[model samples]
Target chain A: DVQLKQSGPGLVQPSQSLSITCTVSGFSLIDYGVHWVRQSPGKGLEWLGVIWTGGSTDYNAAFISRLTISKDNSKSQVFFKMNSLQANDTGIYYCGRPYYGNVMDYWGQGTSVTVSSAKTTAPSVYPLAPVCSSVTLGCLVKGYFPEPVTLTWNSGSLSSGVHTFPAVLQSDLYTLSSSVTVTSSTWPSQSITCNVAHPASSTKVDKKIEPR
Target chain B: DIQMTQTTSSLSASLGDRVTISCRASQDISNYLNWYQQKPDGTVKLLIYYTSRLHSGVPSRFSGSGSGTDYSLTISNLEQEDIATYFCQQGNTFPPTFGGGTKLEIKRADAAPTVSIFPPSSEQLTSGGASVVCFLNNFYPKDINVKWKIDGSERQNGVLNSWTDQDSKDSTYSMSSTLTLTKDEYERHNSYTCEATHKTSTSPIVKSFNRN
Candidate 1:
């Protein structure tokens, strides 16, 4: 009988890396093959990969590009690492070994993981010098981690003409922009202010575009 | 990728009742089918692989029998503790697929397998070739994985007689195995170890015999 003991943090931020350790006993690492499997909260089981007895490995297509499976036979421990995490990665994971035939057998109890969005950064606002039809006040927010952020503008004294671009996602963050068109007189004397609110924010912060 | 479709969404049964679930694949999958028990805590344990072959420690009652594109899992004599979801998977193609699981609710001590070990029978000792028998009885679901060790090292086939296919009845399963070793070898080897690895436990049940 082989016993696989799996351990690791139960939470991870999106775009970050995830790693878990499986320490084994009651059997030799070289005698049997071990696997990493997961179950999403409401979905069926998924096979992530396997670390064979000889140390060779194979990963699921959905995970191959970012997965790393390794083991130290001398230490009787197997490790799993996956980077660029997403919310879909949330689930329960287990380390399993071949019982007999092609199906799995022994397993270390599962460890739960909750993948969530990270905190967001506030936007930067700048009020450019304006003419009757030239200057545009801009609200620029960059490098925010996840969605559901509140970006509100007071509009100032300018006649209302506001445009907001969709948040653009990058390797690990997001960028967003908003701007307003105004009459020359209004643009020169009326400053515009926008508030940023997010789950990580203790208080809603405000950024202002100064009048020219 | 093969598509597996399970007929039942969920089922309920009383103790000692036999329950069956069916699965059909979109295409031919031959005998490359497997069954799993996904518990309420979100752990997925392998039950049967390669059709009728049960995973180690999986009660003999949890069996798979299918060919081509059709397969099924039969839990004979359901117990109270057998409540969980069961899945059917096909591995004959790339991007393996699984069926919607059949949730099982056992209506009584779906208990852990009870284990026992018999010292070398006097007749076996006198016969020059003897055996150590390990017995697992009255466990819900079918499991079978027994290990034999000489002193502290593991021994297989040539030295160990494994558990029988299993005799499942009354919503429970029972199995026994023999580890072959002559009386002289048993006395000279110092000790022998037998371990039963069941899904119900995080660790294996191990018993040792020796001639002091």
Candidate 2:
């Protein structure tokens, strides 16, 4: 069926190296090339490196120093190794058959990786300028490591008018923002708070705002 | 990163016509290209990868070729199942980009949509605005326009239209549009109409919500 099946670790510690194997069938690695690609959450596809049919390799300009692409012609398998993993390196990795110019056609489903770290940061809470009688609150949580953080209002898990944007990666760290709307009746005496829970640090940081 | 542009945004062909979709990249990407078919039912299937290699199970009629910055996906003989959107993706560099999709359509003279307008529900008003939904179902060719009218005047301020969804069983498409109004406008407007225009209909198909 010309399948490329990839197997790798789902989680990697920061500063560690990642190793992935692409098992091929119905095609010989000696006759067809393979490429490694990764896609971070909500981001576009990234061409990491490729091992050509002639046994030569080429890498992305940015990863040429830390990435290695190799193949085992006897086993019809391709291997990818990358070192110095960081928070921003967390993403789903896939291996695909490469055509000329590093274009991939047949792809493995993918293996997800998270470069987890113990370092975490607290969230900053503030009020957005009110356009109506309702009060809007915003929380900026930056520099968090290892995702799956929880952001809630007060002590409740679910509330109305909440919008949480996707986390952005910068300097090997993750940043995210969330907002909620407070009705006029609830804002006057409500104990409104933005609470961030960082599981990697096993801590909950709560930032509260009151009506002026 | 390289950018992909599918110059022909749409194409109309007969059942047996030869069809070709073209793409141009901003930079030299060689043969690093992949073509995909997004079916009417929203299912995406890879047709050609690595510029010319057909993915497993993809029909032989679909082919791709080109080098450097330009590529083309050609259908030797267009079939009824080929009525879908095609996209080209470049993997020559990091952050691969895709061309704007090209939709392939065949004339269907008998296919027309059945229009329905749902009344505003109290459940969706948690944000302090009532939303009225206009639904159109069982249409073919996937091109339709929906307009909102308040009384005798055309309204555009709060209209939100959804993408067309297709039924795999009947090969027909469906879509919905939402019109949001403030509490005051919801009560004040006596007539809110949803006007749907399609290729099959000479006049617009309309359904209204009357406060009276």
Candidate 3:
């Protein structure tokens, strides 16, 4: 009896990529082929693709473009990578062996992944310079890696303080500064501050905006 | 791709009743036929393949005899332990297909019937002495294995056997094994045993008689 085991994270977001690994024991990779199959939350099993002993593959026409299957005989493991996912991609994925003429003779316990969560970013504020007039507040945050980052608005008072709208990214890297609009009715008495919080960063950057 | 359809999704029978299961392929699969017995939650066990040839180590009672797209599996005597689902597979091409399967059930018969031996007893002599003859009535099918044992020792090599095929609602085959012992040995042994084994599509049964 051959056994197949798989590993990967349990959750992901839409439009993201998914990568999973399947390891097998009791048989040599050269003697048998590994297959990747997926079953929706509750549905019949479907064939995805197969990785042959020589590294060649044959995938189901429906999933061929979105699926890639690979294997490492030395490690006795096979790898699967699929990109450009949507809500429909969320399901229990399994890796198994093609036995007795490709009947999915053995299967692995499945690993489920869900796609959710919205993208978020930091907030920027502007000065009360031109009373009741629109002014731009900007902030620049730097990081080594290009991780997922988003912009969001923080709720606060606008009577005595500056009101800030959501910030928008202008480039791929966060090296460039992003700006948000702030409006106030008071004169030079009002004050505003731009704050930047990096999800991967331990600290945030805040810049004060005053009447010029 | 040829589809296999099996009639009688389930079946029931007595210990010695002959049972038959049929399989029909949507297209001609030639003689690339195979049969297997699968237990619930267990891997399927190969039974007959290439038509009537039994796989090595399988009992002779579990026999197959069919050709072309139509095949049948016959178990001689429906034993208590022979209850399970039996499937037929076609290995003629890629993506082998299987029959739905047929379930077998066994019904126990009344207590072992008694048989009377001819020629009351005799003493041992230098040459062969007396002959003991017994009759098994109400049996079916012509294929059977008979063995004569003297004081627990096998005497099949020295026994002559024959069978009569009787066609009842279901085919019935019966056979008998006869043994001749030397007068000296017959007088020395207090008892002898005659065993008859029958096989068909459903199960196997072995009946033994003790002569005093």
Candidate 4:
């Protein structure tokens, strides 16, 4: 019968604070604990921290400095506040309660949030020179915020013959990396463009790879 | 922080299969462990927590157990909906760590639901209030979203009760949700909508009723 429900504003301005609440029923707050989890595209699910029955807490080192977990038991609710909000903080947040050893049992529906700011950096793409094979070039895009990006081979020569691997998220939360391979014949192309695009971002990064 | 090492990298199963995933911690984490399910769409849900406690709203088929440094998760009577990536984490540590994740995939099965609704009996509708039940039958995997809407605003708590029954004979599932309404509300000729949302549909199956 234990239930968790989450509510919060879905937008935040960079450098501001984001607050969220989780209401529960069927269990006493003193007998259980609740944790905050957030998910952004590309970045795998991230655990923020937990506020236990006795008010003791454990938090993710990556987020501890800026995140706070608190509770208001008389109202049967757990709360989260994160400072210095940035586009990287935009995500779907949920309140989760544990069942037993390291197992989360109950969860609230996700509340989607967007972090907005005019200041930002599109990902930096470093395109390695083609291997001795001189055909398939690989590029690493790092340090981008507000994910869920799509990659493109803008060079008309490589466009029809290129393949882009799905992006793999790094531990750095906002950073993601993907590679594109061109056909052996593509070596003849003088240049190729590795364009990274985010539907919500007004900016885009197109790193070009050219003849060594 | 406690490190979690999951022994299984990936697994595939057919319907009715029983699967178990295990994880070992770098140190004694007591029973501070949790298990999660990540869907293809990136919706990660809690399946079990602590050491062996099942999360609320989760089926009994998903379970956990273990102690100290060793722990495990087992899915009994596997269904296609159970296919996904599962992660285990230790909560006793500062940073909190998770298993590499065991990807559980299914063989294949098909059984979409056919829904029906029964209005409350007239005798009860007079004063005792009435219950409207929505039944979803012949569905595989047993995962469905049922909701009652009075006139558009969704009513989740207090007014409804729902349960899903699995059919061993055909491996399908049937679900029922009963919503109680006061006779005054019932006779008001208010439109009561029962919606069943299943993954198989392009949209939800919605049925509406009005006494008038």
> Which candidate number has the best lDDT?
2
> For this target, which candidate reaches the highest DockQ against the unseen true structure?
1
Query: Per-residue lDDT tens digits of candidate 4, residues B1-212?
Result: 56688898887677788889999999999888888887644457878888788777789998898998999999988875786789887878766677778877654476776654545544445545555655555566556888888777677753433342233245455555656667776666567778878877768888666654
lDDT of 1 by residue, A129-201 (tens): 2211434454544445544355667733432444444555545555454445455566546656766665443
Candidate 2 chain A weakest lDDT stretch, 10 residues: A123-132
DockQ of 2: 0.07
Model 1 misplaced regions, further than 4 Å: A118-212, B107-212
Clashes of 3: 23
Candidate 2 chain B — worst ten consecutive residues by lDDT sum?
A: B118-127
TM-score for every candidate vs. truth?
Answer: 0.51, 0.51, 0.36, 0.47
lDDT assessment of candidate 3 = 0.55
- Name the DockQ score for candidate 1: 0.08
Off by over 4 Å in 2: A1-59, A62-103, A108-212, B1-7, B23-56, B64-72, B84-101, B125-128, B140-143, B165-172
B1-212 in candidate 2: lDDT tens per residue?
Answer: 67788889888777677889999999998787899776643344579988999887889999999998999999999877887889898877665666768888764445787665554433324435555656565677688999898897998886655544334344566665667688677878888899988888889888886864
The best-first sequence of candidates by DockQ reads 1, 2, 4, 3
Clashing pairs in 2: none
Show model 4 residue runs off by greater than 4 Å: A28-31, A40-43, A54-58, A99-103, A116-212, B7-11, B27-32, B38-70, B109-212
Give the per-residue lDDT of model 2 (tens digit) for A109-151: 6776887755555433223222216545555554566565688
Q: Interface RMSD, all models, one decimal each?
A: 33.0, 11.9, 42.3, 24.3
Better of 1 and 4 by TM-score: 1
- Sorted by lDDT, highest first, which candidate order results? 2, 4, 1, 3
